[PDB]
Structures are given as C-alpha cells and as structure tokens.
Write a protein that binds this ligand. Structure first.
Ligand SMILES: [Ca+2]
Ligand SMILES: [Ca+2]
Ligand SMILES: [Cl-]
Ligand SMILES: [Cl-]
Ligand SMILES: [Cl-]
Ligand SMILES: [Cl-]
Ligand SMILES: [Cl-]
Ligand SMILES: [Cl-]
Lengths: 243, 243
C-alpha cells in the first residue's frame, strides 16, 4: 500500500449555521469535522473505538492543535485529509490537512490520542491493523505541548447544560471550544483571525457542573486559557493565537 | 414531472457531537438538517435565496413545527425528504418527512416562509420555477400557528455571544432552539422525549443583546416559551410537548 493510500479524504460544504459573522467556518465546526474524519478513517480500517472496545480498550483525545492560513467560506466546498503519523506505546499521533475549494492546503491539524483499558482506566500494539497505516505525509506545524496558565482570577463562569452533554454524560470536546472562543471580544474577531488554536483535554465535566474560565494574555495576540470545574479541578486548557 | 419527482431526499448519519446524553439526535441538529435540506432543494431548482436576491427579494423563516415518534440514534443512517406543499401570495409552506435507517417514517415537519422585498423590508409569483414543484405528498401533522405566552416573569437570562451569530449578524435560528431546550430539567429528558416542537421567529437579536426567557407550563407535558431581547421585545416563541 502506497503512502497516498493510507490517507483518508473527506468532502464537505460550509453550511450557514456553521459559519461566524464573517461567513467563515467556526473553529468548533472544524474540530467536529476533524474528529469525525479521524473516526471514519479508523473505523473503515478496523482500528477505531468499536474494534478497541471488543477487547476492553478505548481511545481518548488528549491534545488537538489546528493551524490555519484561512478558513472555508459559507457555501464553499472543502475537504479534510487525515492519516496516522505515529503509533507510540502510550499515544497515537493523527494528523490532518484542510484543503480549500481550489485544492490549496489552507491548514493543518495534529491530534494526540491515548489508548486506555476500560476496566482499570489505566493507559495502554500489533495484532491490530493500525501499524499498517503509519504514513509519512507532511504536516508542517508545531506539535501541541503542555499549556501553562498562571492567572487564578476567573474571567467568566458557565453551568454545563443539556446542549453541552454527549452520550457518555460529559461535556463534549467541541462544546469546550465554543465556550472558550466566546470569551474573546467581538472587536478581535472583527479585526483579526485565529491562526493557531490548541486544546488539552484534562478531565471530564458533567451536567450541572460550574465551569470557570481563567485567562493569561501572554502577548497582544496570544492567550492561554484554563477551564476548571467546581472551583478547583482543571478540565481543559487552550491556547489561542490571533493575527 | 411526477409527484415523487418533486421531492428532494437527503442522506445523513447521526454523529457523536450531534446527539444528546441518551444518544439521540438533538432537536437543534435536526432543525439544522431540515433547513439545509430546504436550501438544497430550492437552490437546485432555482427558487432559493440566490435566485430571489437577484431580483431584490429573499426568504425568511417564520414558523417551524417538528413532530416525531422517535429520533435517530448515534451512528445510524437517516434521511430527510422535503417538498413544497403550497405557494401562497404571502407565504410558502415547505414540508418534511424524516426516515429512519429501516426506511420507516419516524417524523414530519412543516415550515412557513415569507418572501420579502430587500429594499423596503416589505412582504411579497410565477416567472419563477417554484410553482412547478408544488407537491401533494402527505404530511399528517397539525400546522403550526400563533403561540400564546402569559407569564411575564423570566425564568432565565442569557447574553448573545460570538457562537450564536450568523453571517447576517443575528442570532441564528438553531441557536434559539438550543437555548430554549436548555431551560428544561434533565429529569424530563431522562424520563420523557419531545414529541412536538414548534418555533415562531418574530424578530432578530444581535451580539451582546440580553435574551430573557419566559415560560407557561400549560399541562404537565406542554410548555410555551417566549424569548425577549433587552427586556421588552419578543424575538421568538416556542411550544414544546413532551411524552
Ligand atoms: Ca465525549
Ligand atoms: Ca440567520
Ligand atoms: Cl459545515
Ligand atoms: Cl472500528
Ligand atoms: Cl496541558
Ligand atoms: Cl448529524
Ligand atoms: Cl437559488
Ligand atoms: Cl407566534
């Protein structure tokens, strides 16, 4: 199997309820597409959640970094390519390219997934098919790493609601993205765009939990965000770079 | 052209970030699919927003009623059929059927759209193609009509945020659905399901507006909701029937 053959490619159109006030695809919706594509790619090749679950493992998303030159516009076609870059002992690195209507690469993403035993919730091989799909396609963006947040004064608070919760009873990955991006003043979105966005998923939140949001502005364009539940426990961290 | 030939049919899969804690497609996501399907159907046949806009008209959604026996489950295929039932002088009635993975009709929807002149914002014929697609397919649910809400004590308040706003700078149709459905206690969603849901879109809200929510519980299972902006102006009304 060729290197090109290990890549999954998926076609989309930017719908009106999935774009912002500038008509560009929202980060939350892009994240949704990336994670669904990861799932299509894994499931079609027999190394997705369903297969893992039969042997008492599952996949958990640990880190996501998205870097963009531009975002698709309302009603434009776009596509996502995804592939497995590495399968390490404790984590798998899955990468993405986003392709605009003209076939130009307009962004990239890197995701880091843990495999955990479902009985013990403990972390984490080759009887499977995943190793066969390790692919050398380039993804020329910096790997996501630990995010530091110094502030201990919350800037906003929000209770987890029915619309936030997925089938496992927790606040879903994408809903955290939406809430974080709602922290920023509209003048920022009017004058700049997000060029890099990172999520670190630390712990779970449930319906009724009070989420508090803390933010360090490290430069004019770089913000580090920490979300905590019920005061003290970090549930996720984020880095947002505007330009 | 046969009656069957005037129907558009669109295929979907219920994605994980589009279902609730019981694994069923959310109302907001279903609404999103219905409205997008309406758009696919109109645009493909030359009576959509794009065509209207060339002559200084547009379509505005006035009313939506959805009635369901069940909702698709996570990862199931489903489909939406849509067709034009009537083209009246001031409004067009567009209807929908929702079809489950087995081909069983599991719900219906009715939508009412106004055509308005874009210069004058005034309301509202045959040089177009729409009349050619009037279709007698059955949609055996009650038409939506005016919703009465008596309560003048708000039960909740929310500021319109970046994630709420569409390309025209207003709070989008689907975001109102999500916020309304977040008013109800989780015990209701644990023990009952929404069998009928109606929206009436009265006026627009913008970024930063304070939305207040008023609710009459007319019986154990029927709720009427009014959303107002900045205290006084009604922006939408809703009816939610659980069973
Ligand atoms: Ca989840
Ligand atoms: Ca709109
Ligand atoms: Cl989209
Ligand atoms: Cl699988
Ligand atoms: Cl981190
Ligand atoms: Cl869906
Ligand atoms: Cl059109
Ligand atoms: Cl009404």
């Amino acid at each position: 199997m060729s290197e090109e053959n290990k890549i999954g490619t998926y076609q989309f159109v930017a719908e009106p309820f999935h774009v912002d006030f500038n008509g560009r695809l929202t980060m939350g919706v892009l994240g949704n597409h990336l994670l669904n594509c990861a799932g299509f790619h894994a499931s079609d090749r027999g190394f997705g959640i369903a297969t893992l679950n039969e042997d008492n493992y599952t996949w958990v998303l640990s880190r996501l970094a998205i870097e963009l030159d531009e975002m698709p516009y309302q009603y434009e076609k776009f596509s996502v390519q995804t592939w497995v870059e590495n399968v390490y002992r404790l984590f798998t690195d899955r990468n993405f390219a986003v392709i605009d209507k003209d076939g130009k690469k307009i962004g990239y993403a890197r995701s880091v997934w843990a495999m955990i035993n479902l009985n013990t919730r403990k972390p984490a091989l080759h009887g499977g098919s995943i190793v066969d799909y390790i692919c050398d396609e380039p993804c020329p963006i910096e790997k996501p790493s630990r995010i530091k947040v110094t502030s201990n004064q919350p800037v906003a608070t929000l209770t987890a609601k029915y619309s936030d919760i997925d089938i496992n009873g927790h606040v879903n990955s994408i809903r955290y993205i939406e809430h974080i991006l709602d922290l920023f003043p509209i003048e920022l979105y009017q004058t700049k765009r997000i060029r890099r966005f990172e999520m670190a998923y630390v712990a779970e939140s449930y319906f009724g939990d009070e989420l508090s949001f803390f933010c360090d502005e490290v430069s004019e364009n770089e913000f580090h965000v920490e979300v905590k539940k019920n005061g003290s426990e970090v549930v996720c961290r984020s880095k947002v770079i505007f330009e």
